[PDB]
Each structure stands twice: as C-alpha cells, then as structure tokens.
Design a protein around this nucleic acid. Sequence first.
RNA 1: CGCGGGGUGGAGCAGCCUGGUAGCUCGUCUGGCUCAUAACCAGAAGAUCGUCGGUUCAAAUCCGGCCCCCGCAACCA
RNA 2: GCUUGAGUCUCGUAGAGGGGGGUAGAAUUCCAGGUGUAGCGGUGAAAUGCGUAGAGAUCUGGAGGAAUACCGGUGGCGAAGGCGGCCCCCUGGACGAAGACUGACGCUCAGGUGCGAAAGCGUGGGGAGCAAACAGGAUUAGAUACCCUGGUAGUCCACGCCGUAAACGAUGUCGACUUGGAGGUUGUGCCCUUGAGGCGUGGCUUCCGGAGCUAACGCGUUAAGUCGACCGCCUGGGGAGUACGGCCGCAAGGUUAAAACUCAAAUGAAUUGACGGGGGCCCGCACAAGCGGUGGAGCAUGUGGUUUAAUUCGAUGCAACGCG
RNA 3: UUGAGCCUUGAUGUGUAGGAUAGGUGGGAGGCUUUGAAGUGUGGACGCCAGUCUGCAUGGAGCCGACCUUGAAAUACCACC
Lengths: 65, 116, 55, 161, 95
Amino acid sequence: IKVRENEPFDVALRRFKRSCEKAGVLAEVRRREFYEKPTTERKRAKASAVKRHAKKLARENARRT
Amino acid sequence: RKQVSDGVAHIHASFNNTIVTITDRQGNALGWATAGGSGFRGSRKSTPFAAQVAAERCADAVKEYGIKNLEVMVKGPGPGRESTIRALNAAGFRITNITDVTPIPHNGCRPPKKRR
Amino acid sequence: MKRQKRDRLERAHQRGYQAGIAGRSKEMCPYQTLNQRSQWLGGWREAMADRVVMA
Amino acid sequence: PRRRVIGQRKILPDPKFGSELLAKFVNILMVDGKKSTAESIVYSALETLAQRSGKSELEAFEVALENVRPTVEVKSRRVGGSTYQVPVEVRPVRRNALAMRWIVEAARKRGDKSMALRLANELSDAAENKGTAVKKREDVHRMAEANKAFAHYAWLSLRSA
Amino acid sequence: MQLNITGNNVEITEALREFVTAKFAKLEQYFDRINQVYVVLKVEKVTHTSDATLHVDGGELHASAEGQDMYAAIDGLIDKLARQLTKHKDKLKQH
RNA sequence: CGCGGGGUGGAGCAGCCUGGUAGCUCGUCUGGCUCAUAACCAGAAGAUCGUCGGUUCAAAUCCGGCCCCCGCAACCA
RNA sequence: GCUUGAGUCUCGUAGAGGGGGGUAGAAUUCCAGGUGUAGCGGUGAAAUGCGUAGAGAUCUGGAGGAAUACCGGUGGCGAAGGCGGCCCCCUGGACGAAGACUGACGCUCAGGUGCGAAAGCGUGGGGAGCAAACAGGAUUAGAUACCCUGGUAGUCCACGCCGUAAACGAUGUCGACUUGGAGGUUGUGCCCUUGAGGCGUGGCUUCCGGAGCUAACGCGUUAAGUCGACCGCCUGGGGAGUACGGCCGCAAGGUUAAAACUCAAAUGAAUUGACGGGGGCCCGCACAAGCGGUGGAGCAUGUGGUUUAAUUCGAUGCAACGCG
RNA sequence: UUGAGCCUUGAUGUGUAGGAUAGGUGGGAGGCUUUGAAGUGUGGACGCCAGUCUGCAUGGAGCCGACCUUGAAAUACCACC
C-alpha cells in the first residue's frame, strides 16, 4: 500500500496489508454483478457462522481422546 | 538517455501477464519489459518467473538512463507482483517506497458476467 | 510389503497442503490428535500463501 | 508404493576394482540374466578406455560419467487441459544410474563390431563431451531449463535434505 | 473397428449380420475411435438377449440388452453402448 | 520499348544504406508431451544467393551482358 | 351509561420509508497531447480481435453516463413489491414515558378501488459499463450452447400501459391464552452515573429447544400448541390453467374457466441399498520409476466364420478362446 | 523546431595476420617538442567492450618512420579523395 521505512523493511508489512485488502476486493469485484447472491452468500456465510459457534460450543463436551 | 537519477517503476500485474514500465519521477516512460516478450508464451506468461525475467529485462535496457533509486507502483492482483520486486531488490536498485495503485471503484460500472 | 510412509506426521502435512490449495477454507477437515492436527493446519496455512502466489 | 519405505538391500562390489558403482554398471547392461559376459564386456571396454585415454580406468569411467550425469529432470504433469513438464531436481542416487542407463542405451545404438568397442567408444566420447548420451543430457537440461518456470505445490521433493 | 458376431442358439443369418454390422458402424462413427467389438447373441427359451464388448483406448466397456425378437435387443444394446461411449469420451476429455 | 526496383531454403523475406561465415517464421523431420490428432517445447538438414563474365587479396554485397517478373512511362502509324 | 378494545393531544426517539432538487470522490470508456516500442488481449489450451498507420503501459487535461467501496451489521424502514454516497425541500408510518380527552367509534370483507420486481410495449430524450439477438474464433462426431473476441435492443430518465414472478415464511387477517435459554436492535424507570454497574420495563427481530402438534420432516409464546370472528381456496394424474365465450390490453398476453379422451395410479416425507464426471481417509503392478513382452513374421494350439456326407457336443465380457 | 543542398573545418574506417579500432592511391627518415614530456587531478565521445581524439595539470623538456607479422604498412608527415 504505502511502505517507506528504514533499512529493514519493504516486504512483510506490505504483502500483509496489500495482500489482505487488495486480494479481497479485487478477487470479489473482478466479475459477477450477481445482484442476488451477495444475499444468498451472506445468508449461508452467517448461518454457517452461528452453526460453527454453537457447534463448537456444544462440541466442547468430550471426544474420548 | 537524459542522465536521470531516480525513477518510478510501475508494474501492471494482471492475471494473464505482467508488464513492467520503468519511468522517471515525471511520469513519462523510459523502458518497459513484459512477461510475454521474454520468451514465455500463453499460459507460461501467467507465472511469477516470467515476471522476474521481465523485471530483469527491464532493469537492463534502463541502464543507459543511470537510475540509482526507484519507487515501485504495483497495479493488478496477479501471480507476479512480489517476485518482480524481489527482482528489483536484486537488480541493483534502491527502493524508496512501495505503493499500491490497484483501482478499487466505489462501485461504479458493472463487471462482466464471466464464467459458467 | 513393508511399513507405513512417514507415519502420518508429514503425511498429515501434505494432506493439509493439498486440502489447503484446493479451496477447503473450512480448516475443519483435520485429524484430532495434536501432533497431526498441528501440521494439517501447518500445511493449510503454508498452502494459503501458495494460493496467493498463483491463481 | 503407498506404503513401505522398503527394507533395502545392498550389492556386492566389483571384484577387479574396489567399486560398487561399477557393479551397478555391470547390472545395467547385464541383459538376459547373465552376469559373466557382461563383466567381460565391461573389463574389455575399460581396458581400451585406458589405452584410448592414457589415464586410469576407474577415474576414466568416473570422469566419463560425470559429463552425462544430470542435475534437473522433467516430470510430466497435467492440470486441466495442459500437460506441461515440471523440473524436479534429481536425487544423487538416481543421478548416476540415470547416467549409466543412457550410456548403455547409447552403446546399444552406435553400432560398431563388438559391444566392448561400442561401449568403449561411447565412454570415450562421453569424456570428449561429444557422443550421444551428452546429447540426451543436454536435451534433458534444455527442456527442464526451458520449462524452469514451474516450482510448485506438493507432489514432488519436499522441503530439503 | 472390426465387429465379431457370435451366437448361442441363435443362427446368425446373413440379413441379421448385415443389420447389426450397419448399426455398429453407425455408432462407432458417431461417438469415438473404437478398436474392436464383440457381439454375443443368446436365446434362453423366451429372452432374446445380446451382449457387446467394445475395446476402446480407455479400455473395455460392456452392455447387455434383453428384447423380444433379437432385433429389439440389438437396438437396446446399441443405444446403451452409445450412452456409455458419451460418458467415456468426455470422461477422457475433461478439460 | 526506354527508365527504375527484384532475383537468396518449398514459400515469404533479412543479410548487402562501410567487401571477410549465409540467416528468422511457417512446410518437413525427429524427439519429449497427449488416449490419438492437435497446441506447446527442444534439436536438425534444408542454398554452389537467376546464368555467364571482370574488380581488387577475397563479391549474395561492386560493375557490365542475357532471361524472368513489377511499376513509370513513352503508347497519335 | 363505563373504560380495558379502538382513537386523539403534549414531549421526544431511531430508521437504505416515499417524491422532487442539487452535489462529491474513486473507477470504466472515449477524445486531444507527451514519453516510449514490440507486442497486447484471451483461454483448460488456442484462435478470432487490436498493434509499427505507434498499440498495451505511463502522465496531463477534458467530455459523458451509470452505480454509490469502506461503514454493512441472519442490522433498519416499508402493507407488499422494495428501499444503501452526501445535502436541502415537501411528506407517510412506527415506537416509548407521563398524563388528559372521546366512549365500542371495533375485526374481517365477496363485488370494487389502489399499489405492485424484472422482462416487455408506446412517445420523447440519453447511452459510460454490461449485454439477449447477431457476427466471428474455438470446443465437439455434430455444437444454432457453455468458453473467447466483438456487438444492437434493453439496462437510465420523464410521461402512459402491462399486472405477471419460486410475488415464498411455499405459512390470509385480527384477538386471547400457554414452560425456557442465548443474542441483535431500539426506547425508558429506579438505585452507589459513584466503574463500559446492578435490578425491571415496552416494541421489532435471529437462532436453539420444552410440552403440545404433525404422516414425518419439522413448528415450537413471532406456533404448524389451545380457541374465537371473517374471507380466499382444494377434492386422483394427464388433457389443462389449455380450448370456446365474456372482460381488460397498443400488442405480447392477463383473468374467468371446461369437456371428450386416457391411466390405476400421480404424490409427500422418511428408510435400506445402489449410484455420482460429490467430499474426506486408507490401500492395490492403479499410476509414477524400470525390465521384458503381445500386436509385424513363420509355425503350434484353440475359437468364430465358411465348407462338407459329417466337419460330434459343450465352454462366450472381466470370470470362453494350449478350455472339459 | 526542422529537413535538404553548399563551403569551411573536425572525427570515423578493430575481417585474416597481430607490437595494432592499418580506409584507398601516390609521395615518402622528417616533423613532433621545453608555444612549460610519458602517468593522471581530470571530462566525454566512439565503443565492432579494445584501442583513438580532445578539455585542464599538480608533472615539466619528450615520439615515431625504415628495422618484427601482412593483399597492406603506419592520421612518422603531406596531397587527392
């Protein structure tokens, strides 16, 4: 994004913030208007969020290991 | 040939190709080299190694302008984009700062529908 | 007819690496023991970077 | 196989010279299950490699071998529709055996009168960097070095030694 | 692609061999390069059945069809073979 | 009916805008690859440089003569 | 008469609720100019395409159109359809606290009227990007397709029409009652706001589960539980939401809506298998790494065919073909 | 800004052979220099990456020709180009 600093620099910070927000929004916006399935993909994503949270929570009983 | 001191290294880094345009501070071009023109063809253009060979074949043929230090702009979410700046640390340059000029619209025009 | 290859330790690595590259952003198909889950996830996170470097 | 880093057995060294590489070389051109006449071909060829080279025989064979041993070797892979070759580094056990297989095939070509004369001349041009197995060596290096742009995922040669 | 005809209790007449051969040739031309085809005709007191084994580059593929008059069984077998061929063909295209 | 330009692998042409060794894509031949054809990649031969002359050490390159083209004309017996 | 149902008033509260107007930034495209030169673009691979007439890239300027990244929240508002930059003007509804006021003014509603995504149609503008039709390149046995390169209606605005959608919560509206938990959002009361604190209280909403219900799946105080009021609709599958007739519409067509015939089924949910060009894990001469073969040749042996007086009979994918 | 033409000048012309980035032809042992020398403070061109031109010295009074290799002998010097 914007990295300038003193002599140990230039790679890790930049590939971090660059890679995350860059690859996110460009890999999203590169095609597929969709108009309809951000609704479905957010609904499935967040239903999977509550199912993963409750699933790990009630899966915190035992596993016989 | 102009005897320039510093330059600005734009790296267009699309999916199918990387082109590397080393310019000056002013914004007008001094020399460019692509990942297609370095012998790599078709699918082989779409590798980081062809971007590295592109940055080499630009970093010489900008020798005659005498650039000690350059900035790095990188546009495009491609498979190059990091090997091509390792290939500018290694090519004998002083990297001033690295930016990101990847165009993110505050969603405007409509993208294509492409895949099935 | 001989014995198992790299006894699930760095086979658990490459299962997590192949499963890391071919999507599966679950990180929820590992083993359950610690010494194999640790590097199923280790190969998974080593495969996310190898997904960023390519298409 | 899927399983089994296999319990490996070693070989007998060569009688006339203190070498197991040479005994492996006898086992390469040991066609049809017959070791003795292959030993006579190898000894009969290293003698005229000594007289047609001046230097000693074991160093003659080894210097003649290191000009055909490879470094990179292609592995054909397919993803989707493409089927490109990807350079893997050869492991140094496979290295010299892959050299000797090319020497022995290039000696089964080239046809002169006798097999010891064919293999003797083929090792001579392998010292001269001139014959057939150096052309196959340079073919392998040209196509692995030409396809050098592929270093990837997990199906080949994990981290280091 | 050479078609070999054989018959268990079914006397293979020359008009029977002409028709089967034509149908097989037509199918071979339409779907894939085929190397060899074995045809077996069985009659079991009621059921006119037919077997076919196609040897194609990928490998063997087989089908079987029971009918009423032998001709019907042959037609069923040929359609089944064509369906199997479509599966094998783009099973080894799969770009 | 005289001026110009071209004669170089099978073909298209660079070489010759300062004489010293024949070059690139295809077609054509291998090999790797592919289920086979393909596509990709890596190698190889492919010419006495249109024919005779001469100008110097040595000419595809410079100059005469001939043949074949392509244009410009002269084309009002 | 009465105030609990319903409604009004005084304070606030949040909100992509609606209509009109204006404006901002990023990006895409084009045009003019500069630098610069051999490729760009695209795919699973490619080619069509664009480029030595200077493209792609990079910089400066300008034009025009459209949509509003982040905030963005199983968050919010709306009767539903739906509504996301920011600001102004006009305007609807909901909610809560404390009172006052009217006094059953209420619920539902056939016909009717109104609103009603997208596509489409008419008139006039506008046209960046995308994109049916269409062209071309591929792919394929074929490929009027998916993939690629282009590209016109349309997408946008103003005014009319159409009146349908998987218009879905596949759940009519209104009201009452009936164990819990975890959250979201939005008000409000008290107390040590003394600390993002504690205890209650209303509204809207998300998930999980109790009895109960259900054919099961599942629903479960926002019910598909227990009841009440009113309306719409169903009576085997196909024919068929089709024909004829009416009504509406510029048309496309929408609504209302049969019958002859034909079948003994059609269906919903769940089960055990089998199957998948679904997934995960393990293994196999399955692939990879190699060695030697078969297919070319002569001959042996077996089989099919043909022949014959008979060429005895059987074995026929793997699992018949030097087999009995 | 910019071609084109014309003068006046000034650089450039490494095949092979090799002391060498020798252009041709002809003449040809005379000029260079203390009008403050080879090296380089220096700064470039060319650059067929090895050698030549000129800018300023702090040095300061020096160099080749015939005589070694070549179809060829020297921008040792000059003329015509």
